Amino acid sequence: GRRIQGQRRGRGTSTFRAPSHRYKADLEHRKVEDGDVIAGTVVDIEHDPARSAPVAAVEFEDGDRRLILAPEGVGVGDELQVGVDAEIAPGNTLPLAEIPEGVPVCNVESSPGDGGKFARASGVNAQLLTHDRNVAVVKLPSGEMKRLDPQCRATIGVVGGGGRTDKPFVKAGNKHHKMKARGTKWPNVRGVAMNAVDHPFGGGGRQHPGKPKSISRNAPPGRKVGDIASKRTGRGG
């Protein structure tokens, strides 16, 4: 047959890429020599075309002007601080160690200095649970308990824009516009709607998959579609 669509993606052609040139900034925590002295002021709140969530423009003391993954509750005028000795208020960033357990955090680093990887989507947040000299235990939005170097920096508070998922798109038109700002081919044709040649589920005089949908982890690309290595399916039990 022909390559299925998931293989077409990999090639990174125009149709599958993200309109990067239209994106604003790569939100990442600032680098600080040390001391923590670094502080700055919230000059403005903008829309991030890459995350459909708000982002804050900040002016740091040393002249640096950079956009920042904005947590809920940050307004124009506010002063944020980044450093080991940063105060403990929403919007400020400091290593998990300096953060008091029981506090909601976002934009957490996977390894100290990477600039933040975890909990950055609309209204999400991690939960710093346990401290230690060696391990900082954090509960990521998926609910997983993640062990992190207490040196990984993070932002206090929950990411702004919460509740976006609450309201239905209502019409194709609205999905359309959202999709056009992402690295995604849309709309989606159902495999079972295609021809044998185009997809393992295609073909037949009626529409149904040929074999069972749960595919083995070991399946090669081109065949790995449907329910990937499903541990179970359906709702019963």
Binding site: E72, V76, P90, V103, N125, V158, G162, R164, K167
Partner: peptide
């Protein structure tokens, strides 16, 4: 005053929990 808030509400149930903690 320009603020960061929920998507359809200025405050979200989670944004309030932060103030406390």
């Amino acid at each position: 005053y320009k603020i960061a808030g929920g998507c359809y509400q200025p405050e979200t149930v989670a944004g309030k929990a932060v103030m406390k903690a």
